[PDB]
């Protein structure tokens, strides 16, 4: 089968450069043009350029001529996209493709000046005794970390239903997110509820127990 296998995620500072590889297999590499595509925001798509592998001939979106440089290696049957002078605007998922028909899996590129920072985890307990249909919603607030991702669990994965972990927002180079869990009033606070927050990039794992603070 035809495969296009791209290299892993890149995390670099502004002004740095990056070089993404695209390994092609299951057809004659030089017979088809390789295309490169930018996806911003997780949706919007832009053609960057394409390359003829038989000769080295390239063609660029004028928007990307001073940004991208496309090359190949006939032996490794691999196409490359080198991106220079990186800015925040360059953060995206970049795809290679045979024509615009068969697609690589994409490569996440993130550009940021931020240093690795594990999150602060704060418990979110209701301020009052009020119930709604014998349910309590509890939460944790995961604030000021870099880079993505964090993973949140509740009771070490024991509480999996009624959970919403929200996408992170960026404030001032750092990320924040929240997680809610809803359980019966009869289970909390008679039973402990704890959020578990792992941050692979700093190899930290933090627990925060939700402690009642209402007064009946």
């Amino acid at each position: 089968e035809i495969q296009l296998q791209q290299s892993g995620p890149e995390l670099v500072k502004p002004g740095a450069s990056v070089k993404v590889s695209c390994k092609a297999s299951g057809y004659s590499f030089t017979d088809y043009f390789i295309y490169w595509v930018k996806q911003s925001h997780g949706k919007s798509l832009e053609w960057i350029g394409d390359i003829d592998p038989y000769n080295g001939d390239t063609s660029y979106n004028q928007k990307f001529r001073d940004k991208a440089t496309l090359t190949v290696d006939q032996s490794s049957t691999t196409a490359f996209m080198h991106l220079n002078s990186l800015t925040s605007e360059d953060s995206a998922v970049y795809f290679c493709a045979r024509g615009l028909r068969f697609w690589g899996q994409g490569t996440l590129v993130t550009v940021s000046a931020a240093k690795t920072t594990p999150p602060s985890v704060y418990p979110l307990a209701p301020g009052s005794a009020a119930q709604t249909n014998s349910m309590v919603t509890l939460g944790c607030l995961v604030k000021g970390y870099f880079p993505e991702p964090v993973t949140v669990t509740w009771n070490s994965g024991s509480l999996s239903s009624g959970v919403h972990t929200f996408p992170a927002v960026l404030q001032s180079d750092l990320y924040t997110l929240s997680s809610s869990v809803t359980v019966p009033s009869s289970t909390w606070p008679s039973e402990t509820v704890t959020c578990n927050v792992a941050h692979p990039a700093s190899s930290t794992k933090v627990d925060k127990k939700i402690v009642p603070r209402d007064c009946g």
Binding site: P126, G127, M135, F166, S178, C215
Partner: protein, 214 residues
């Protein structure tokens, strides 16, 4: 460059329903249009080439057509795997350009948010900060607005919102809203209110707490 305006940008429908997505070309693109499908893991696949030709192994419920400058992808009878993203692409003239996309979402009964408000934790206060968080959970349809009020006065600054994708199990959406202040400015005021206005009522859902109450 050629602009491909794609509509709708999202569409609610249900299993068995028939739907259509459209791309309008700003210049004659002839029959040179691809329809692409994208899976949630980011995997792209081509469904249609040359406006109306189905790729090998694409189910027959998919068709492409054209009228004047409008190009459409029709799904005659939706299946569960169909509720993903779709993009047109023109290759008549370089630079090749894409429509902005359509996400197909699952139709369900309207549902009001369960709204919850949370005072800043004492751990955060101790560090000099004060985030007030409001969850607006399990509502349908997707559109919703939140207003913060401090001592009855509307507050816009320092508010950050985040929206989940449609729940895979119950097809609802959720929102979180966080108002961040310094400890000092949090302690100058007393009533913190989160107001949620959703299609399921003319009357907003109001949750508050007072700084010193339990």
């Amino acid at each position: 460059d050629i602009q491909m305006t794609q509509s709708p940008s999202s569409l609610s429908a249900s299993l068995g329903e028939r739907v259509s997505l459209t791309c309008r070309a700003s210049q004659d693109i002839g029959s040179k249009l691809y329809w692409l499908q994208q899976e949630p893991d980011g995997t792209f696949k081509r469904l249609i080439y040359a406006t109306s030709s189905l790729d090998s192994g694409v189910p027959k419920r998919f068709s492409g057509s054209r009228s004047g400058s409008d190009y459409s992808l029709t799904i005659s009878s939706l299946e569960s795997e169909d509720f993903v993203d779709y993009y047109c692409l023109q290759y008549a003239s370089s630079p090749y350009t894409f429509g902005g996309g359509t996400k197909l979402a699952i139709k369900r009964a309207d549902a009001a948010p369960t709204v919850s408000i949370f005072p800043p934790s004492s751990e955060q206060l101790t560090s000099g900060g004060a985030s007030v968080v409001c969850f607006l959970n399990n509502f349908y349809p997707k559109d919703i607005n939140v207003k913060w009020k401090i001592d009855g006065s509307e507050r816009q600054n320092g508010v950050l919102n985040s929206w989940t994708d449609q729940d895979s199990k119950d097809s609802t959406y959720s929102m979180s809203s966080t108002l961040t202040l310094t400890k000092d400015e949090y302690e100058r005021h007393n009533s913190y209110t989160c107001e949620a206005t959703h299609k399921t009522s003319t009357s907003p859902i109001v949750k508050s707490f007072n700084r010193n109450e339990c």
